[PDB]
Each structure stands twice: as structure tokens, then as C-alpha cells.
């Protein structure tokens, strides 16, 4: 169930939004607010605001709405009397799971488990997923080092007062341009934008360059090969260097496509080799699919494109999946309870919704659709690039996970602002990139719709 | 709506629970699991398991269920067609809030705002509340230091690569026995149990002793006064010491009553003085009400017992509150957006539920009820202490937030295990304490119900 197209009544934000923004701004900093929404009237690919504006939404709540707004299948779930308890009786999942906990996982997350990962722990968001993935990894590394032995007396004592060896000085290696969340652990592995990091205490952990590809890809085969090789070499040197500082790299975290930092792509070959380096040095390979996961790249998990039997040790997710969590190998299973733990560890209401979302994704063939719609989108972007090289460059994407650069931040923001007033919600990333994160009910006719409007925008620009 | 009492059919965990536990254990470590539940049949103060056992629940999903299971007022919310969207259209609250966002906050969290705190930011759990409170504090502290000066070029550059001065070496002071969550930031301030901390990298941040009161309170007035003074002095010395190490204490975090670490209490005087020390040294005073908050101590926020006009700079909450977040003073307001941020920043569905929960707490006068029911509970515990000094000691509590010690861990676990098979869910904390976290619909007759059962348990133990 969708609308037929966008319909604008006012500039955005409109008067009602500006009123609500003023109210909210009393209680908190509200400068980030785009506008206030009428989710009750929003349907499919279209977001409706409080001023009656109806926009084609290619941002999708920062890539977190899987099958559009007010999806009728999800409506039905909420209407079912049997499901009331799930929404009002939130369990401490770690100790008192509901009867249907395992079965609902079987119909949801377990049905899309990545290769070689039999374990699953749930979490409420992307950040606690990565934080607990870090801890899982640190525990695995020490377990690997201590063998099947008991905790030492020294370790039990020192860990309580934040000291080695109880609290080891181990590191997680991350990449420039990365985004993994903003809690203090995640934040150390994030390198997206200075405003995200500044004034916050961090960790002295190794930071490697992520490949900056040159476009068009077919004119820079050798240059891109060399850029990737250079980055891989630098990763390995950092691992070695930090082993020597006694700040042993216990794991490596990477996005299959860097998002907040500017939609940075690398070849599948790059990731396969990175995974090999991880294994070579005994580093856990942690793949962050919080934003790439959920099918928009044309495969459920973006890392599937790599074609590996053993793609990773740990994989985190959230956003689109409604709930957070992480898959991992059996060998990363915590040895004892109450190490990886928190009150809620997700929410059964989200699992309830997710099971239906995955059913829709499968029955409506939405992975293939993302590849196709994404192809149409990318083709049109390439055509616009050819027509407006003064405004558009480095057009790139996989599935509907697409983007392009503009000449500077100011132009980027202006084009987003114009597009929004014209009926299209676009996202920005990095300093000067515009990104696309359509929901999985985005079809080729939506791509054409968008390409038409943006086409006129560029001619008028 | 409540049941008339507990009804046991089997040992707990029972056969169906053990079957489900086996299934879950394939996918994850499930040793923490107590049993699987039938929330659909759970009502009021009673938790029903999959084996048909119906227990008086004085643990309440680790103190997170505010007004009992399947509360009819909450049932009605879910049944309202107008509320469907709220459950299926989850917004990125930081950028695209729903029309009713401010109003729903006005009917919920803002109606219980602590004294002197006009600001509110929402979060999905206790851990991201404390993590983002830490960041809020670090941002505030550096803003004091730089004053009207802009971010330096050096700061902007170094913050991206995890280095000073961009990433300052500031600390948060915490207490032994504390529990503030398990993400890597929170974890550094947690000092609950070794198994929670071990193998995880930490921060070199100051750790002060939390007062250990001797019981009974009226026999140890001077001793307890001196213990508290000793602790306060040590806090101040740590603040001074960490200034000299250039690891400046930017804030202090404390629980009004330490929970996971062993239900440790301190006098209101102690907290007033601690707050004064915080102010004296320019440290933000961060009060963690994630577990104490929600009314069980007889006041909505436990810190209200201190009677201060200016009780804190920042106060975090979650669990009972359905959503997480933190109130704070206007002066702690972030200067720019995208510093305190994440995808979801809570969930409007939880705010919907919370507004009704708060309405119930008020109409049914549940704060006063907690004080009264808690008094009855404590009196009975004191009587059991008198009758069984060989098993019970240090009986203590505020409101229904009560506990007592047993001689050792083995006895503690055995008594909890017996109580459970007899129809009462109890919680443990620390090495050898049993704790009570009843929901807010726990009445004096539930306390008697528990007391009669536990009394029989002690009689033939
Ligand atoms: C958004 C994001 C996260 C964090 O998710 P939150 O729920 O906002 O904490 C982590 N990793 C990536 C790649 C993300 O895009
Ligand atoms: C439970 C708790 C937390 C953490 O809350 P989560 O929702 O488990 O992340 C933090 N502080 C205190 C005092 C708590 O009781
Ligand atoms: S850190 Fe994930 S819900 Fe709070």
C-alpha cells in the first residue's frame, strides 16, 4: 500500500513543524530536527509531515524502516489480540524469556543467519550490538590466551578497579571514515565527523585508512587496486605495531560500505583480503551491518557479495532489523553468563514485527527488487552525472545503497533542501555526499519518479 | 486485576522450561535463564511460567515492570486503533519526531522532572542513558574550560584519531559496588562483580568507597557517621589526585541506593554532602536512578528523599520508566546537534505506555502505597531477622526497595531456589544478599503472603 506520488502544500519545515520545533527546543537542542511527522498518514515510501506535505522518502529514518510506513501486514499484527502481551509485558530477556522466544527467533533472525555463525545474541540498538561484540571479542581473545583455565586471583582483583591484567589493554582496529555508534566504546571506532567525536575521551586504538576509490571505476582499475593494497598493507602494519605496544588488536571492525562517513565503497576482493589478514593475526573479524544489513544492497547482508564461506567471526545489525544483535561463531560464545548481558537485550515486540518483515521480504522478493530498482536508480544517476558534471561526481552504489558527491558542503545542503521542498527526502553523508536509503518497497517507478524531479531540479539549478 | 495467590504445579524450572532452555542453549549461552514465561497469562504481581506455575513476583524483570503484568489500562492502549502507527512506524526521533512527541512527553517524563532540571533527552535503555550522560558531562566540562573560544584546529584534527586534546583524558568518578551498565563506558564506572568486568578494557578513572552501614542503624550511629565521613573524604582526595594526574574528574556518578552490587544504602546526609563536594570541585553530579527511579522508594525519584532544591546536574533513568533518557540542567545542554545522538533515541511506543503508567501511579496513589507496603514488608523482615539470626542479617530498605544478607552465597542461592518452588520469585544481589523489587501494585497483603511462605521455608531449612 503506497501513494501515487508526492504532494507539497508548504515549504519544509512548514508552519506547524516550526511551531513544534520551537516547543521541543525548550526541552532539548532541536537543531537536528528536519520536521515533525504524521506517521498515521504516512504509507509505504511516503512520509507525511504535520503541514500536510507528502514526500517520497529516500532516507527512511536513517535507513531503519524496512518495508515502508504503516505496512498493512504490520498493522494486522498489532490488531491481533494475542499480541497485546508482547507489547505491554517487556521481559528481562536474559533471565525470563517468553515461551515463544526461540520460535520467534527461528521465524526471524535465525532464518537469515550469516554463513558459519550459529550463535545469536539480541540487543536493542546498533551501539549496544557493537559494544557487546567488542566485549565478546575481548573475552574470546583472553579465553584463547588463558586456555581452559580458571581466572587468576590477580585478574579477579584488578578487574574491579579498572586495572590490568584483569582489564587488558587490548584494542579494536577501526577505519577512518567509519561509523559504529556513539557510546564511548563504539565512538573510539567511529571516525565519521569531528563534531561526533570532539571533547569525548577515547581509546588509543589503531586507525587504518579505508580505500578512497577513484571514479569512474573502469578508468581507474590499477589505481584502485593499488589504493586497496596500500590500505591492506597499512592495516597489517598497524596490527603488528600495536602488538609491540602491548595493545594487542583483538578484533577488526569494518562496514561493508562506510555510511555516515561518506558512502565509501571497496571491492569484494578488498574485504576478502582484509578477512584473511584478520585471521592471519588472530584478530576477530567484526562486520558492522547495522546500516548495510536488511537487503538494500540486493542481498540480505551486504557481506554476502564477498562470496565467502567464512565471511566473519561476528556480525552486528540493527536499524532495518527493528531489533539489534549480533551473529557469531560458536567459538565466540561467552564461557559464563552475566558477561554479555543487560536488562532487556532487545524487545520481543520488535522480534514479532521483524518475523513478519522477513516474511514479506522473502514472499515479495524484495532483495531482487532492491537490486533492480537500485540498478534503475544508479543508471539515472550516471546519466545526471554526465549531464551535470559541475554538480555531480563519483556516482556510486550497490543495490539502492547509492550516492554521489557534490562540489562542496553548501551545495550538498542546498540540493537536499530543494529536493525536500520538491517532494523528495534525501540524506547527506560525509562532507559533501548525497546518499540514498530507500525502504525495501521502493520500486523502479519510484526511482523514475525521483530521477524526474531531480532532473528538473538540476536544470533549474 | 490480580490473582489471589501463587499456585505451583512443578519444580521451577519445570519440564517445558527445561525443554525451551535446551533449545535456546544451542543458539546462545542460556545459563542465566531462570525459566520461560507465559506473559499472556501473567497478571498484576503474578508471573506465570510455561509449566503453569504461578509465582508472586518480587523481582519484576529486574525492577523494570512498573504496574504489574498485563495491566488493563495498558491493554486498552494497544487496543486503540489510533495507536497502531506508534507501534509500527518507529522514527529516528532526533530528526523526524511525531506530531505528538512534545505533548506525550508533557504527559509523561516532563510531569515528573526532578528539581532544577529543565532539559530532557530520551534513550532506549539505562546504559545509553549513562553513556550519553557521560558525554554530556565531558562536553560541558570542556565548554567551561574553553569558554567563548571556538574549537581549536588541533582539537578538531586530533579528535578524529582518538587523541588529546581533541579527545580529552577526563574521568568520571564512580564507587565500589556500583552498577551503571555494561557498555564500555558505563562498565568503567561499574564495580559490581568480577564476572561483569573481567577481560574487558577499561578506563583509569577514580574509584571511591561507597559507605558500608553497620546494622542495626540505631546501634551504630557514630560508626556509620564516621564511615560516611571517611568515604566523603576519600572521594575528595581522589578528585584532587586525578586533577594532578591530568585525568580531571568531570563528573561523579552514584546510585541513590547501590543495586546489583548489594543494595548498599547511605544516609541522605551522605548524598547531600557528596553533592556539595561535586559542586565544590566543578564536577557534574550524575545520579543514576535507572533502578531506584519509578517510585518503589516511596518517592518517584529516590533522590527526592534528600530534600534538595539542586539535587543533581544530570539524572538518568530507565527500567520502570519504559524508556530511558536523562534530565539535566539547562547549562548541560549540548551547544550543537549531532553530539548527543543516535538513530532512535528511545521509542514513542514506550512513551505512549509510560504516560499511562504515570497516570496510574498518580490516580492509584502508588508512591504512598510503596512506602506503606514497603513498611509492612520491612517490619516482617525485621521480625524474621529476630527469629532467624543464623540465616538473616542486615535487614534494610526504603519503600519496597528492601533486602537482607545471608551467611554465604550458597545459602543465598538455596533460599532463592526454595522460595521460587514455593511460589515466590526473589532476586539476589552482591555475594550473599537477597533483594526485593516488587512492582508498584504490590500491596501489604502480598508482603504478608510472602512473609508467611518464607517463614515456613526458614522453619524447616
Ligand atoms: C547507525 C549505525 C550504528 C549505530 O546504531 P544506533 O542504533 O544508532 O546506536 C552502528 N553502525 C552503523 C554502521 C550504523 O549506521
Ligand atoms: C539496570 C541498570 C543500568 C543499566 O540499564 P540497562 O537497561 O540494563 O542498560 C544502569 N544503572 C543502574 C543503576 C541499573 O540498575
Ligand atoms: S545502548 Fe543500545 S538500547 Fe541503549
Is residue A329 annotated as part of the catalytic site, yes or no?
A: no
Q: Which helix (H) or strand (E) holds B123?
A: strand B119-123
Q: Does any CB of chain A come closer than 8 Å to the CB of residue B417?
A: no
| DSSP-assigned letter for residue B148 | T
Cβ contacts of residue B45 below 8 Å, gap of 6+? B2, B3, B56, B57, B58, B68, B69, B438, B439, B441, B442, B446
DSSP assignment, residue B296? Answer: T
Structural domain B1-70+366-461, CATH architecture: Alpha-Beta Complex (3.90)
Task: Return the CATH number of the domain spanning residue range A71-365.
Answer: 3.40.640.10
Residues 6+ apart with CB under 8 A from B219: none
Inter-chain residue contact B184 with A131, CB threshold 8 Å: yes
> CA of A390, closest CA in chain B: separation in Å?
30
- Strands B249-254, B171-175: pairing is parallel
Rounded distance, CA B158 to CA B154, Å? 6
Contact pairs from chain A to chain B, CB under 8 Å? 380
| Residue ranges of B 94-113 with Cβ closer than 8 A to chain A | 94-99, 101-102, 105, 110
Among residues B112, B133, B88, the alpha carbon closest in space to that of B316 is found at B133
Sequence-ordered list of residues with C-beta below 8 angstroms from that of B277, at least 6 positions apart, any chain: B232, B235, B236, B239, B252, B283
Residue in B449, B151, B120 with CA at minimum distance from that of residue A28: B120
Distance in Å, CA A126 to ligand 1 centroid: 4
Residue A14 phi/psi, 5-degree rounding, is -90, 180
Q: Which of B50, B139, B171 sits opposite A199 (nearest CB)?
A: B139
Pairing of strands B54-57, B424-425: parallel
Q: Which of A49, A57, A263, A288 is catalytic?
A: A288
Q: Give the position, in ligand 2's atom list, of the atom nearest the Cα of B288.
A: 13
Give just the sign of the alpha carbon dihedral B442, B61, B68, B100. positive
Number of residues in chain A: 461
Q: Which pairs count as long-range contacts for B359-366, CB under 8 Å and 24+ apart, including other chains?
A: B359/B73, B359/B107, B360/B67, B360/B71, B360/B73, B361/B66, B361/B67, B361/B295, B361/B300, B361/B440, B364/B441, B366/B67, B366/B295, B366/B440, B366/B441
When CB atoms are compared, the residue of B96, B99, B200 closest to A135 is B200
Binding residue numbers of A: 125-128, 182, 343
Q: Enter the resolution in angstroms.
A: 2.3
Contact B354, B108 (CB under 8 A): yes
Nine-digit cell string for A7: 504532494
User: What residue segments make up the domains of chain A, in order of their start?
Assistant: 1-70+366-461, 71-365
Active site residue B319: yes
Question: d(Cα A246, Cα A241) in Å, to the nearest integer?
Answer: 9
Residues having CB closer than 6 A to ligand 2 are A 342-344; B 125-127, 130, 179-181, 255, 259, 288, 290-291, 318-319
Distance CA(A78)–CA(B83), nearest Å, equals 9
Distance CA A430, CA A413 (A): 12
Helix or strand holding residue B47 (H, E): strand B46-48
Say if the Cβ atoms of B336 and A31 lie within 8 Å: yes
Smallest CA-to-CA distance from B377 within B357, B352, B399 is with: B399
> B44 in helix, strand or coil?
strand
C-alpha cell at A31: 537543531
Distance CA B256, CA B292 (A): 7
Query: Which residue in the list B104, B319, B320, B432 is annotated as catalytic?
Result: B319
C-alpha separations of B460 from A122, B380, B388, B424, B450 in Å = 41, 18, 12, 17, 16
Q: Measured between CB atoms, does B128 come within 8 Å of chain A?
A: yes
Grid cell for residue A428: 547527506
Residue whose grid cell is 528481562: A92
Whether chain A has a CB inside 8 Å of the CB on B66: the answer is no
SS3 for A292-344 is: CCCCCCCCCCHHHHHCCCCCCCEEEECHHHCCEEEEECHHHCCCCCCCCCCCC
- Is residue B80 classed exposed, middle or buried when 0-12, 13-18 and 19+ CB atoms within 10 A define those classes? exposed
Annotated binding site of A for pyridoxal 5'-phosphate: 126-127, 343
> Is B414's Cβ below 8 Å from some Cβ in A?
no
**What Cα–Cα distance (Å) separates residue A235 from each residue in A275, B131, B160?**
11, 29, 17
Indicate the pairing of strand A401-405 with strand B249-254. unpaired
Q: What value, to the nearest 5°, has the Cα angle with vertex B252 and ends B249 and B256?
A: 170
A contact test, residue of B30, B31, B41, B96 with most A CBs within 10 A: B96
Instruction: Respond yes or no: is residue B332 known to be catalytic.
Output: no
Nearest CA to ligand 2 atom 5: B126
Q: Enter the C-alpha cell of residue B71.
A: 495491566
Report CB contact under 8 Å: B29, A98. no
In B, which residues are within 8 Å of A81 by CB distance? 79
What H or E segment, with its residue span, contains residue B48?
A: strand B46-48
Place of cell 520488535: A350
Residue from B63, B134, B178, B180 whose mutation best tests the ligand 2 pocket (most atoms within 8 A of CB): B180
* B1 at A interface, C-beta within 8 A: no
CB atoms within 10 A of CB A384: 19
- Name beta bridge partners: A396: A403
Has A343 been annotated as catalytic?
yes
End-to-end Cα distance, chain A: 34
Amino acid at each position: 500500500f503506497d501513494y501515487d506520488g508526492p504532494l507539497m502544500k508548504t515549504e519544509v519545515p512548514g508552519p506547524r513543524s516550526r511551531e513544534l520545533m520551537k516547543q521541543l527546543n525548550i526541552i532539548q537542542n532541536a537543531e537536528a530536527v528536519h520536521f515533525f511527522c504524521n506517521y498515521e498518514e504516512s504509507r509505504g515510501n511516503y512520509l507525511v509531515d504535520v503541514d500536510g506535505n507528502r514526500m517520497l522518502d529516500l532516507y527512511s529514518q536513517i535507513s531503519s524502516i524496512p518495508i515502508g510506513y504503516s505496512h498493512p501486514a504490520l498493522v494486522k499484527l498489532v490488531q491481533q489480540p494475542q499480541n497485546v502481551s508482547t507489547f505491554i509485558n517487556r521481559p528481562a530477556l536474559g533471565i525470563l524469556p517468553p515461551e515463544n522466544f526461540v520460535e520467534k527467533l527461528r521465524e526471524s533472525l535465525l532464518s537469515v543467519a550469516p554463513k558459519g555463525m550459529s550463535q545469536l545474541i539480541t540487543m536493542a540498538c546498533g551501539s549496544c550490538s557493537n559494544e557487546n561484540a567488542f566485549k565478546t571479542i575481548f573475552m574470546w581473545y583472553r579465553s584463547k590466551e588463558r586456555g581452559q583455565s580458571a581466572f587468576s586471583k590477580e585478574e579477579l582483583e584488578t578487574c574491579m578497579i579498572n586495572q590490568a591484567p584483569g582489564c587488558p589493554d587490548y584494542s579494536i582496529l577501526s577505519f577512518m571514515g567509519a561509523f559504529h555508534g556513539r557510546t564511548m566504546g563504539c565512538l573510539a571506532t567511529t571516525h565519521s565527523k569531528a563534531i561526533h567525536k570532539i571533547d569525548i575521551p577515547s581509546f588509543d586504538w589503531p586507525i587504518a585508512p579505508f580505500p578512497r576509490l577513484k571514479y569512474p571505476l573502469e578508468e581507474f582499475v590499477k589505481e584502485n587496486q593499488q589504493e586497496e593494497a596500500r590500505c591492506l598493507e597499512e592495516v597489517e602494519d598497524l596490527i603488528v605495531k600495536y602488538r609491540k605496544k602491548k595493545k594487542t588488536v583483538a578484533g577488526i571492525i569494518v562496514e561493508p560500505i562506510q555510511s555516515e562517513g561518506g558512502d565509501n565503497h571497496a571491492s569484494d576482493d578488498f574485504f576478502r583480503k582484509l578477512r584473511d589478514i584478520s585471521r592471519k593475526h588472530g584478530c576477530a573479524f567484526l562486520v558492522d551491518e547495522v546500516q548495510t544489513g536488511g537487503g538494500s544492497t540486493g542481498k540480505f547482508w551486504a557481506h554476502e557479495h564477498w562470496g565467502l564461506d567464512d565471511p566473519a567471526d561476528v556480525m552486528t545489525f540493527s536499524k532495518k532489523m527493528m531489533t539489534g544483535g549480533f551473529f557469531h561463531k560458536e567459538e565466540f560464545r561467552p564461557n559464563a553468563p552475566y558477561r554479555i548481558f543487560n536488562t532487556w537485550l532487545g524487545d520481543p515486540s520488535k522480534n514479532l514485527l521483524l518475523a513478519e518483515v522477513i516474511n514479506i521480504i522473502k514472499r515479495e522478493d524484495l532483495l531482487s527488487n532492491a537490486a533492480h530498482a537500485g540498478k534503475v536508480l544508479l543508471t539515472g544517476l550516471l546519466d545526471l552525472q554526465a549531464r551535470y558534471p559541475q554538480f555531480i561526481s563519483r556516482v556510486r552504489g550497490r543495490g539502492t545503497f547509492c550516492s554521489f558527491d557534490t562540489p562542496d558542503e553548501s551545495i550538498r545542503n542546498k540540493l537536499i533542501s530543494i529536493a525536500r521542498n520538491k517532494g523528495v527526502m534525501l540524506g547527506g553523508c560525509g562532507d559533501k555526499s548525497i546518499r540514498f536509503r530507500p525502504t525495501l518497497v521502493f520500486r523502479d517507478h519510484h526511482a523514475h519518479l525521483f530521477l524526474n524531479i531531480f532532473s528538473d531540479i538540476l536544470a533549474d539549478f
